[PDB]
Amino acid sequence: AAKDVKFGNDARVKMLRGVNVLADAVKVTLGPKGRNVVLDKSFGAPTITKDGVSVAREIELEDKFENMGAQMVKEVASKANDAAGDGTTTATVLAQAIITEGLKAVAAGMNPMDLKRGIDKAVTAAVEELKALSVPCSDSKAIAQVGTISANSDETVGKLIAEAMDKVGKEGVITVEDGTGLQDELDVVEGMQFDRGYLSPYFINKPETGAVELESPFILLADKKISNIREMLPVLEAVAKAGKPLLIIAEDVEGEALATLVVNTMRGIVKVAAVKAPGFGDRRKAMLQDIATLTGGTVISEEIGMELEKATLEDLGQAKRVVINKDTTTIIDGVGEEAAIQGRVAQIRQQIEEATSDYDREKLQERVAKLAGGVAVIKVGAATEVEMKEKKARVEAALHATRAAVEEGVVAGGGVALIRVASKLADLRGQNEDQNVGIKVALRAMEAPLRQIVLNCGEEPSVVANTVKGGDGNYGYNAATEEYGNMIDMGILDPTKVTRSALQYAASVAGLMITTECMVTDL
Amino acid sequence: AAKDVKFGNDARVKMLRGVNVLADAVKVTLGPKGRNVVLDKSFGAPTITKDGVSVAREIELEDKFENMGAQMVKEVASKANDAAGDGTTTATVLAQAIITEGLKAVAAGMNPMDLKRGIDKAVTAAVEELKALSVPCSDSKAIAQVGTISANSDETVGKLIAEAMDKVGKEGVITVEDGTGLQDELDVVEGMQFDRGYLSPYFINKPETGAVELESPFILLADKKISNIREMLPVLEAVAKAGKPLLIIAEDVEGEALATLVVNTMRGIVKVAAVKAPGFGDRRKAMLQDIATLTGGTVISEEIGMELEKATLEDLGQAKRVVINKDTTTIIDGVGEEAAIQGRVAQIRQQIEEATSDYDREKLQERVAKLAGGVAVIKVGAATEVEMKEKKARVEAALHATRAAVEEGVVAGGGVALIRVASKLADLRGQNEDQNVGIKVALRAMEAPLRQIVLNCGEEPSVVANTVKGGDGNYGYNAATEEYGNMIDMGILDPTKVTRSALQYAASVAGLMITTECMVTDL
Amino acid sequence: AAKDVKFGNDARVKMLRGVNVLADAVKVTLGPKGRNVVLDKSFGAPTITKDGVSVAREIELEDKFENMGAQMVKEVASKANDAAGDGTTTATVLAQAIITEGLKAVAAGMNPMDLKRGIDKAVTAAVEELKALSVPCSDSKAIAQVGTISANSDETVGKLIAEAMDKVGKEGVITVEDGTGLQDELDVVEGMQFDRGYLSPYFINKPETGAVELESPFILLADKKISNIREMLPVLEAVAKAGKPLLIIAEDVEGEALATLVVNTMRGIVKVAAVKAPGFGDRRKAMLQDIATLTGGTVISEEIGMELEKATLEDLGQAKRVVINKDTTTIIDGVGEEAAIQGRVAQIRQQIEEATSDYDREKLQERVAKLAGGVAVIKVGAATEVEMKEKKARVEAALHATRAAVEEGVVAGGGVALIRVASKLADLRGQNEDQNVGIKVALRAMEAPLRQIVLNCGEEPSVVANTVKGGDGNYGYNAATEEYGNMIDMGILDPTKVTRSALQYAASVAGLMITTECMVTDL
Ligand SMILES: Nc1ncnc2c1ncn2[C@@H]1O[C@H](COP(=O)(O)OP(=O)(O)OP(=O)(O)O)[C@@H](O)[C@H]1O
Ligand SMILES: Nc1ncnc2c1ncn2[C@@H]1O[C@H](COP(=O)(O)OP(=O)(O)OP(=O)(O)O)[C@@H](O)[C@H]1O
Ligand SMILES: Nc1ncnc2c1ncn2[C@@H]1O[C@H](COP(=O)(O)OP(=O)(O)OP(=O)(O)O)[C@@H](O)[C@H]1O
Ligand SMILES: [Mg+2]
Ligand SMILES: [Mg+2]
Ligand SMILES: [Mg+2]
């Protein structure tokens, strides 16, 4: 309907207020100092989680303007959250500080554009500093510590992550499942994971994550694309006798012919999934073969002249479960044959050696690696189901952060990096004063999140911040210790990527918020 | 729609108030001192039951926040209630005490996390103490006493439970049915019970319990899974002539093929149930045979080459009634053949002796035991139908508690164990003061429920509690006696499991409530 | 329903107020001095763009009268915006100034008709002056500057435009696509663009622009019109096996026979597009051949006697993507054959030389040119997706302005031309005093937008305007420099066309607004 539009400060104020409200809840929560949080639901019994984001997610502002402003922060934060895996709160915190200052500057009447530019400039500088500052991720002990941070003093999670990580290998993917029982179980599962997307979000399964899990999926592998129903049909007929959920692997499915018939014609009542076959060219075929062996199913190719129609259910392999995400599709455990799987690996392994070329070797080695590596599953036990879910969520978050952290390497946590960089940043000047102030603002913003932790401590963040700044090198405040020590030595490190990601997003949000002169809402 | 969100104390207060309201009603009811209770219904004539839970169930809070808070307690309590079979109220009572104190601490501004940790720590310690404290369940006389407790001075129920228990055997399952007449009837029913789930909750019958009872069920046993309709169909055709409700036993039914056709295609107007055949492997087959003999029906196997289609109704056995619960499925009474059943038992019995191996013996013995044991049914008479229903419900509750109690063993009732443990607990210290207070709080919480009983007595719980604490060993207050005596000697014992369960859940709830900074509701 | 009607000043005032509100937001935004702008949305997260228009678009007036008045300005402005590519704001600014003065005159009670006439007369004179004033567009360096203006100090955009422009050629069309990644990519794409409309807006694709883009379009070329389904059908059948989206090229499709069947009979679920074949006569055929070669598809003609029905999918070519706009339809990249395409070009090229006649040469040369030129695609990277979209939009706007600007040639920006012309204009007199005032008003209107920029600067526009007027030749104020210098030398030039377009439209609007005695609204 009609929209109410506000311009200038009035628009800004609404945004600011909204931002603060969201930020405030988030800020307190963030930091190990902050207590976890439970979220009430009108819908049903309250949801128990430990995420800054969740608080934000819950929080809605009645005021449209405020709400919208709040929303803006959240969306950006989530984006940072996804990439970083962590630091959702941090970005929010950073954004709020930046925005407020920026708004004040707007109040100043300085031209916000320069400020944004200055902020951006500052951010870039900070990023560079951070990168230099950052150091490679430390060993598993560090990993556990990294895990613990995501843990928020969940020792078990960190341990689990480290343990899972060790067995699987850092590179190897780790999957989390609900625990069978209170005791956690870590079982390596045989199977291969290949990075393939899900063709359509429609395929995407019930769960919020949107990764699709199939129970006892059936795997059909075809090198060939599945053009039309007719070729499909005789597969289907066997499938009808089946009815265990179907997963399909094809080089590609041409959307219209297959999908049009499938969607419109076919109810698709039986669960189906489609993924592109991994790799391309011979390698793709090889990968398919590897998959096929692991599945224990067989692959049909035109070259073979095997017909999909002809192929029965038996040809299709089965998996204990399959999980698919947009980035990647994995099979937790193909039934496979133990001998068969091993034999294939050896054969591939032999091939790897055989090939003179690195390229050939790499492909072969990659192929073997996938099968050999398998996938790792982690079960989280809990005293209660609710706890388990909560624990599981935390575990998952930790895992992603840990994985990201390791690759990125770790930087001192506590926003130490942020504060440290800022000091260097301060010297840098923007082109013009307006830019200069913005740059300063950004610096100020960085400082704030350190303070917030301190505030949670109840120690006066001013002293801490001042002290932190004074210390050269990696100097920081450990909340738990409440003692000054090297962050690295302490072993509490925040991932570089996460820190970087959050800062950039927050800056972006802040800049956007500052710029946005006007807001419009519905009446 | 839009949600109203509250944070901090404000959120807490709403929860607290809600908790109190629910708790208060429950607390008074709990304890033999408390009077039973009737629940009004707008729907229709009031419902008469004797459960603390029911009061809670009825109670809804108009305030969303309060209501939600209330809900949280209830849900946890119910969970405890299910496992313990009893102590629903106790958990609620415990939770309330813990929550209030925890909230106060929150008011204190101590970091609730430590408190929760302390509480958890305290709980763990208490649990250990309780376990040591607990003693094995006493004999039937004790059992009756246990029954009486569930009875809340329902002598008959305890007697019935004991009587039923004796005949059936404690291990043997006892089932309760509405009494034919005022006089209770205890009839042992021939039949076997095997622990199998119901495939789908959809199958789950009308009654609230969700156990499904079939009247004159027909039993089809197939070793083989029922893949598809077609094989099924000729069974069905016979069934059409039939129309007595069908129960199906199959090793498994593959969901999609059978279910998809069945659900979509088949109205399923005739009652149908499916259960997995008990056991696996040969034993499963053997079990099926045992079942088949008991049913008097025949089993069809691929190995036999008998066809389901071929099999007629006659092949299917009939049961007088079948009850299915998720944990287990039982047949109250297969028509069976008296001779046939006996013969099979003997044959199995011979087999048991025959097998050298323990394993073989165990399976065989288990098989015979099921048939031999049969199931026991208890009828509850009542002056009026309404009374009977009420009585029946009480009886059922008592039975579960008794069964749980016996296995667990009995500990002094009256919350004596709780108070006793607490004293020991007090010495234990948490890591930090905040934890310490939480630990103390938990201890305090334990004490409270003893007081509540005393309050019902009208005696000043302080003195009683003090006295109780002072006494070493099992020292407690018997409400009925209003005299001090050994709980064990008194023979009023609360099950260890129930006590433990309630405490843990309550603690969990309390901890959660404390933690939950914020609540959100719809507007 | 019933309408509320206002006449005379009352109607005018509502319009005026509405105009001002819209204008005010726009005016501030306009000019590099003005900050960009973000637009709030009730619908979802706010939209980030940099357009004066967008602000106007957002702005709606609650008052019907005001809103309607506001709408009038916007619609005209947009029209100017489309043609000019730029100067949307300028027109709005101009209109507002004119309207207010005109209204005042209406208040004066002078007969507005004369005023309108005077305004029109003034406009015409101004236009002539502008045209003389205008100079040809300068070289790429200028182009970049032109780009930067559209950029609003987006250096990259200007660079991209210049870079894209250089490679493609100014004449050559440049297309913008979202960047694959943060880094922009400029790839020339092989393909030909021919100016053909889309038969129906229905065809028009999802995007707001209404240009239709097909992914991997299939191209069917027929010289012949597609009369009816039947001939079509065998094409369709092949297509059914297909299902990649179809694009159709035909000399014409007779609407009723094809469309009636197609629309009604055919769901048209598969994407389809139709375009008229470029050119007419032999040239058209030749063009088709060129297209066909580029596509790699084949064309079917009656003369050939090839049947559409007979023709398979293979005959149809494929394009990586096709974009269609009403003015023109382009194929970004036909798969084509590299050799084939080249060969055809050579063949055509030979033909061009071969033909004695200029006419023949021109057609041939044009034909070759299209293939040879190909299309250029620009990718815009962004830190974030949102940014990219915003950047992309800006880029697109810049491109259109640049293209227009170059052809038109550049005139001094800053409204320098407008002010300059006005002085000359002032001498000119209208037929009658009422006309005279209107003429003056128009002159005044022209001056205003210069002032607005100055106002953004915060410099007093009076002095600047006076100074600007005083300077002969191209004299203007550079906001960025805040120094006086030649506009041309500065290199900040606004396109003649855009300036002219905006002025004319604004004048038209203003005249209309003045004339409109009465407004009617719904109640
Ligand atoms: N003992 C500690 N001393 C100093 N800072 C710590 C300590 N443990 C963790 N932190 C810091 O607390 C922050 C991590 O907490 P949290 O994960 O809540 O923040 P976040 O990642 O921004 O929020 P969210 O995880 O909800 O997105 C990091 O800056 C981390 O270094
Ligand atoms: N004569 C008695 N003296 C002392 N305490 C008693 C006596 N009889 C029963 N109790 C105690 O009263 C409590 C049992 O009552 P009740 O079953 O109402 O509590 P509850 O199990 O927590 O509530 P609900 O059964 O509604 O879940 C136990 O702690 C039990 O030991
Ligand atoms: N440094 C400068 N000095 C003087 N005027 C400038 C300078 N850079 C740009 N301008 C002027 O600002 C105006 C262009 O800004 P803008 O594109 O916002 O106006 P617009 O085209 O009317 O609005 P829109 O683009 O929203 O339709 C032109 O008159 C242009 O010459
Ligand atoms: Mg985090
Ligand atoms: Mg009880
Ligand atoms: Mg413009």
Curated annotation (Swiss-Prot), chains A, B, C:
Changing residue 75 to S: Complex stability is significantly decreased.tuberculosis. Phosphorylated reversibly during heat shock. Can be UMPylated on a tyrosine residue by SelO/YdiU, probably under stress conditions. GO terms for molecular function: ATP binding; ATP hydrolysis activity; ATP-dependent protein folding chaperone; identical protein binding; isomerase activity; magnesium ion binding; unfolded protein binding. The modification N6-acetyllysine is found at residue 116. Disulfide bonds: none annotated. ATP binds at residues 29-32, 50, 86-90, 414, 478-480, 494. It is an enzyme of class 5 (isomerase). GO terms for cellular component: cytosol; GroEL-GroES complex; membrane. Its main location: cytoplasm. It catalyses: ATP + H2O + a folded polypeptide = ADP + phosphate + an unfolded polypeptide. One of its GO terms (biological process) is protein refolding. The keyword rRNA processing does not apply. It is found in: Cytoplasm. This is Chaperonin GroEL. It comes from Escherichia coli (strain K12). The lineage of its organism: Bacteria, Pseudomonadati, Pseudomonadota, Gammaproteobacteria, Enterobacterales.
